[PDB]
């Protein structure tokens, strides 16, 4: 019935941690994209 507060507290904390990771995941996925895009630009220049 309570320790409901406790559950809510911990879950919220896990969710906040989850967001800081999704944020880290986003910027790295972006670094990976710009590198693949750079790689395709070289390839297109090599082949052309």
């Amino acid at each position: 019935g309570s320790a409901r507060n406790a559950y809510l507290r911990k879950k919220i904390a896990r969710l906040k941690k989850d967001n800081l990771q999704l944020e880290r995941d986003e910027q790295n996925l972006e670094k990976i994209i710009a590198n693949l895009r750079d790689e395709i630009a070289r390839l297109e220049n090599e082949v052309a």
């Binding site: 409901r4 996925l29 395709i40 390839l43």
Partner: protein, 47 residues
Amino acid sequence: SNLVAQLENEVASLENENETLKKKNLHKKDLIAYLEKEIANLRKKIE
């Protein structure tokens, strides 16, 4: 009571933001597979 109400709001706010940020990522993941298939077919050209 009013407090548990706000806490449960917070949980749900954070779930929504994360769920969207997770989708934006899953999409960058589809994008990556796409560029990689591009590179593979660009390379097939010279090699």
